[PDB]
Amino acid sequence: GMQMTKEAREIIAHPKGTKESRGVISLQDYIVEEQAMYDWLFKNHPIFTKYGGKTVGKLVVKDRGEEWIEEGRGNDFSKASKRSGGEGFSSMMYRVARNSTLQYPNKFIGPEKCGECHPAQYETWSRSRHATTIRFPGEHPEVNNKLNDPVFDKDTASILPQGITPDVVYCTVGHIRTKFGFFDAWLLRGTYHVEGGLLKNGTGQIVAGGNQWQRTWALNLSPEVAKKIKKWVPDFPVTLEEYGDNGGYVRGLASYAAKYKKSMSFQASTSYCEVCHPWKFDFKNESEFYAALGNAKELQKHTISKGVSCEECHGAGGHLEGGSGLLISNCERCHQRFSYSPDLMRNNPLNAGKPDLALSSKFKSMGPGCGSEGSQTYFTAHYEKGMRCATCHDPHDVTGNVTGEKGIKGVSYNSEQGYLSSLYSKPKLKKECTDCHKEQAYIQSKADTHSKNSCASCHMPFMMSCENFYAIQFQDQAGFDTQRRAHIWKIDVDPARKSLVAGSTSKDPRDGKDWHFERNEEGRNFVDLMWACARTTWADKDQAEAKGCHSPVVSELKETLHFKDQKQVYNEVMGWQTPVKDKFTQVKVGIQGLYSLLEVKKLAPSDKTRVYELIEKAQDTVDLIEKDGSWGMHGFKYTKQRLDAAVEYINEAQRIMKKS
Amino acid sequence: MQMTKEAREIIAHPKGTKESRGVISLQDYIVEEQAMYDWLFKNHPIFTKYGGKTVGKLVVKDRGEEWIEEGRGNDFSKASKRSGGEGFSSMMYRVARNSTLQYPNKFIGPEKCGECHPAQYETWSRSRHATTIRFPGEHPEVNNKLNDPVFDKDTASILPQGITPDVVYCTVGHIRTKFGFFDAWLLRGTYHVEGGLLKNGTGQIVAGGNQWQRTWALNLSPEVAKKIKKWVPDFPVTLEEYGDNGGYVRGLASYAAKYKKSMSFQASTSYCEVCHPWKFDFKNESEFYAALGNAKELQKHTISKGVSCEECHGAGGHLEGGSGLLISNCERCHQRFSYSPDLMRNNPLNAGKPDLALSSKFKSMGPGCGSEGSQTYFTAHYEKGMRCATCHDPHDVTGNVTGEKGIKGVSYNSEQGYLSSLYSKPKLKKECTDCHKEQAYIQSKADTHSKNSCASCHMPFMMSCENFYAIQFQDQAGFDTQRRAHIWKIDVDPARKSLVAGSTSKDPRDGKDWHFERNEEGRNFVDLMWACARTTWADKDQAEAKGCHSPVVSELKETLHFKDQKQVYNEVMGWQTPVKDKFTQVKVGIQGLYSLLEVKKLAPSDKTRVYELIEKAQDTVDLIEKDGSWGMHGFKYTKQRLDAAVEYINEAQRIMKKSL
Amino acid sequence: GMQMTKEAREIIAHPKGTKESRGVISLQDYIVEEQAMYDWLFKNHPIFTKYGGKTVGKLVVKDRGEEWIEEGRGNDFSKASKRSGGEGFSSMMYRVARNSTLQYPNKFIGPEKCGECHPAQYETWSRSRHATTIRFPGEHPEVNNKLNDPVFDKDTASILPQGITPDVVYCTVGHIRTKFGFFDAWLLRGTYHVEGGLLKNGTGQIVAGGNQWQRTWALNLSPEVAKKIKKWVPDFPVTLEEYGDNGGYVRGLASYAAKYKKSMSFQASTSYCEVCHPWKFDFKNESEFYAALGNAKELQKHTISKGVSCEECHGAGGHLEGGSGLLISNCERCHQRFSYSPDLMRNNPLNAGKPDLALSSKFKSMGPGCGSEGSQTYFTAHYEKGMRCATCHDPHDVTGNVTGEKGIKGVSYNSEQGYLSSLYSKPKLKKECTDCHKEQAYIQSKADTHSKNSCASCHMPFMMSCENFYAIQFQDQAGFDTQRRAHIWKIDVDPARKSLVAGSTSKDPRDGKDWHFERNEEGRNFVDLMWACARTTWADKDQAEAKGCHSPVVSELKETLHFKDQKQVYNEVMGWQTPVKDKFTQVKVGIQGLYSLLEVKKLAPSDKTRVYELIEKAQDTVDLIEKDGSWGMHGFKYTKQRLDAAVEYINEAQRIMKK
């Protein structure tokens, strides 16, 4: 029936933490501390006290033992390592650095207190999604504070699912940007709704799923857009019923950590959400905490920090006397999301004994997860060269000056609330690509086909699934659950090889088993050309402003520029790169031949001068093209024409040489 | 006699965090200061010996005004959503760790850090950070004569009349700019004693006459002042013309006081301990209060003076029993943010973003010393991730500067290294030329300003350390000019000014709400009068380059004495207009010729030759565009490159001309 | 009477620490706290309890008083400083940042617990020599776990010297890479062996020295190689006896902190080793610690951190609740090793009052010591520009993918334990020379004599001594005790000036007194041509794959490329640089004159265009060669191809200007 997971039960039965032995809290101490919470929930959550433990769909407990220990094949990683004799535990993706929300008292003073002395950082931080990821009812002006009304069209979803009303919700998680979710007053993750009644008075039935409000489904993927995609992808779901387990009762409210009417996780905020979308309460001790649980108002009134606040990155009380000590976040708590791939291990016998080298990112079904930018960057040249998040990003102003969409006429949507209203993100950067890649920027600056595209538009497609909307993941088509920006940069040019592949445990192309990034010959992640050129998304401002790129679904270009498969994209690339690489090689061979001749042939001074001059001008051209390294993809006309001139330089020198 | 209204309101309704959370925050510091002021009202000699009677009124200035109200913090607070607009904002003056009111502390002193880090002790100890706080007997640069004239026999001593070393806890400062003193009661020295000696309670307490100023004592003689008056007719020459700002002898001005009219009554705790600190070894507060009033006792129990290792790195650093290691970002002492209602109002894009209307603390009409951080905050360097530590060594902040052997003063001694110096030469990790290669390359060619440093134009000494408003005539780029601006961007305009009065100003001399202007990119900028024609005696580059174009200090011919910004602007236009005109024709030429290369009627070899010439010309355009000074970095070289490109374009046109 | 050092006792008699006065432990507190340990050892170590205090060779106590205070002339530095009126102390090279191994309880949880949440960094750190510098018997698969049999040839050394058996060894220190040492079960540094019996039985005699297993002596420096070296360096030692006090009873076991049969340091791990090759125990208090001492098994059982583990760099407990506070190591605890040189101060009157500017590195006799990369880099352009270890190095994967020497057979050596078996190091870097030095890299990329060398091959010779094997230090010949890589970069071009020189106090070229680095006119350390080009070493994989470079000992090149002195190297450099500089000057002067002429001669527009084209293309060449700054040493053939073109350009423009 109802119990903690195996992993947790095994650690509880034989704990090897350090709190008692060393006076220092470590991973296993966090697994054990969670037991009272689950015991309290099995006795006091309405699902047991009012609904008799009955649900439409099976309840499935998912505590820190599964999230912090088992996730990302941490047991396989552990067995593959020498650490603790191959007998230890590995927390691949979900863990905290400091005390959890089960420890009272804590030393948090709240971001407003940091802001008294650091008013400048408070301002830029406070207009970011870090600051408002956790909010209370009354803090949603972007839907005029109507959490139970349709956001967009009147037949699509509200933020809160039916039967969940604001007075039984501790908080929402998320934004209009991508998705929302909710926590009830007992700090249980909202993996359910209530049909035929309300949670608030124990009426109706608890139903699994239909729990996660999804912007793209609600706004952009109408039945007519779905039917357009279905012309290309004959399995694409159109009717609500074709979304199946991933769906629900109304377009816009999908099932997440649940399958609709079939199963639902039963999970406290402590097991998972506190890692990345946190809050902290001001209670003196845990009794005060347990007495306030189940009362949304009392919990809210005692909330001293919401979301990714100053102290979540910099430590409770920062550097203040009596505080816990200053930290400077490297972001890996919430943005790394390592996941071990036995396939990457098996496929490269050179990696033997180095299970770190077979790390991938957490996948949500067939797409790399949101909050995986760190595990993605780990296998890039950038990271090898010492670059980290803070190299490029401002850590405070992470959302930027984005705004609402005035053209949307929805039932509750209000476009005028700044970033709260926005469908996009524009993080403030310390470094642009053009700061370090000057030759690429130079070629790209010459007026041509993509000369208005940002560097990011080809190099950082929106490959990541935040929603685990597997009903719409058709990855070989570079769509359609595409809400976060890949941090990989390297573009592979190949007719067939894919960035994203199924694990060897997969038995159907759509089962979603053990999907992972593939690695190229340099041991790095890469972006395939279907993602780079032809991806489909509604999260990409650059793409929206460049005619939807080459997506058969969102491109506004003529239809002969709609790219349907990677081989077609590859052949377009080849049409540009092959003549460029031919002229390049011709020049290189010409330069070498002429330097050989100059070592033995004697020429009149004015002719010697000219021959040398042409060789060196040809060399300037080939050095520039070689350093650029795109073989015409950063600007074909400038590139081809410059090389043509250089071939002609070589031809002139050869005539002069032949003459003498 | 009472604490300020601001401090009293917080005392009446405190909302700090020391009791509620075990963590000391801003409001706790306001509250803790009460006992000190109660003690000073009963025990300070002004009251116990002079009966409360002063020539000039006493105006209490505690943390309530310094750490809360300054920089228009209450206006910033009301403009913020933080705490519903009802909070407090510490804009410029606050500490990060315990104040000097908490005993015991964990400070061990810099000599102990020095035992294991002898290398950093050596570089730090020969810096002004190390000696900004000194005790009588530590002033070899004036032969330890604190009561005799430093320079000429008719100019000031460091300590004003009535103030003797034995009633002084310390001096603050150096010969570099200015000195001040604290009395043995740790009250700031905003007064002197006429017809008597403080130590005897004889004579009368007189407001002002309290801050020794190097520039007034040494450089600004009535002869120099008369020379200035010739250009600037309201410039003061006689001592009485210096008015409230002055005093009874040249070289002792009034600061935090107006001569015979008003004087601040302020403990060290309210203000100075933020930036020119000290720490005592007392085991508790009773020992501290028992020593107060005894200079020798305080001195003996002083464990840290000035900006010592632990002031940046934390009491005890990383040592066991220490308070935890810090790495200073310098904003404690070098930021000095100040909110400008005008910057908010003037730019409706800034609405709801009061951080964007931040300026720097002004000392009347000039940006204050220690505002390098609030200046750099609104620069491209800062946007690109650059911070103090990007360019500066944090230890060797003074450099190898020395005294002036040519000065013959009553007490000045020129042989004490940096103590004797008029200048500063901070050690740098990065020079402008390390990152700005095109600019450095053009600037390296022998020409008019090729021997100037980059910093000589880009970083003028715009900042007032002394608040010597008697001599501030900002439209003329003088004359209270002691610290170096960290702005870099130079605006090229006939009239627009860096520094402007606030809209509360009713007279050009009243100095109300002065602030920096912002350009179209939202950045601070340096006007041409500052960049080219400023008058200062703190700038060694300017002293070694014939005084630049200051009508007051220039040793150049008189037509190179620039008297207003329009004149400077016309000189800049004499260079940039022909450059920009030629550049423009070359660029249009290149584009036109490139487009005409698709005309038949052109021999192939003519076609290639045309290309070869416009290609070379494009190199010139690219260098000039990148440089971006339009000849200000080296007119002769810029002209040599453009003359070449003019020939290339005329030769290509000559060849094109045959087609017709 | 066995007692602590003069230096320790003087501080103990007049202590000026901060632990009692301020609640904060500082340097003098660490000196004071070492008393009980030495008193315990004088009473309880087998040297006294089983061998009656008798040893072949004099016992010389060396505690924190000498190591943490007197070393590197800290007393001279102190007297040259204004700090504490010239009357303070200065810890030049050996000191800790946080509690020593004398303080109990501590807050260490061990690297496996860090790695539970940081599995990635655990993996890379765990395959590095930081992780395994401290090991217990049982953990040496690279010798088939035979610490008492010969490693390599049957007539060379085992890791543990005779009389010393695994059961009375707490740990080894080191690797096959360079050398090993041991600590006995009482945590005394192994500066001795036992002849005629076993330490564990109290039989035999304690003999001084012959205590440090040395890879290069054991493997590479056979009597035939030594004879080859002797042909060039006549005083070079060939027979065991010619190694003298530095030597011992078997090739491969040298004397270190000891002179064979003559003297031996008596030193607890606390005095020196715990700075840089540390461990930590889990004991609740110092009683459990002392009760365990002398029992290797119980000490091992209670060892919670070994070697340079996560917490040694990051702090006990890291950032965890109840831990001691996160640190980010800047490496200077173990890799700096500053040493004050009164010669550098005296030779430069400008440095007066500034003793920091006369800092050098720890020397082990006549070679800069291992673990002095920091004091070296401190006087480099790179450091002046803000570069630190972490600019170039990954701090975790510091060993790299190096492997055993397959092809050598030895009685015990096992070549398939990966980095454990390896003779070399390949630290993972964040930045390569070529990332910042583009012009140099471009010229070096052109196929030519050295175009296949790494940048580091010439710029970072293996100048440093790990072993203090002074019997084989002949520094004017750039050999032969050469185990770690110099971090200096700047190459000086001179027929005679040397990087490494003897102090003023030296009275014999081989007495090894006060050796230091010389400083050039820019105030920096520099690499002389002998070290850069013709050095001899067995630690440099780049050199072994490039035919041994120009070493007369290891070079496989023709004998005319065996460089025997610096004057010869210099003459080879001048043969490249002189023609380059001559053409460069010709071009540069010609550009200048052409631009002047253009100001006052008139030409046909079409001629004028030509003169400009030729001058600008010559300028491009001048700017590249000048920025490169090697005057052909980065690629003579290409450098000459560019300058040959630019001489033509200028000649042709002068031709045109003549009419």
Ligand code: HEM
């Ligand atoms: C791409 C690899 C290398 C880089 C990045 C590099 C870098 C440098 C740099 C920055 C300098 C300073 C130049 C100056 O003073 O302006 C230099 C000088 C020098 N390098 Fe290299 N180097 C490389 C490879 C080599 C190799 C393989 C050798 C020897 C075969 C070598 C020998 C020298 C010498 C002898 C100098 C001194 C030149 C002089 O001052 O006269 N370098 N190198």
Ligand SMILES: O=S([O-])[O-]
């Ligand atoms: O549930 S969060 O990973 O999108």
Ligand SMILES: O=S([O-])[O-]
């Ligand atoms: O009083 S200080 O800001 O020059």
Ligand SMILES: O=S([O-])[O-]
């Ligand atoms: O004994 S360690 O300095 O190679």
Ligand SMILES: [Cu+2]
């Ligand atoms: Cu997500």
Ligand SMILES: [Cu+2]
């Ligand atoms: Cu000042």
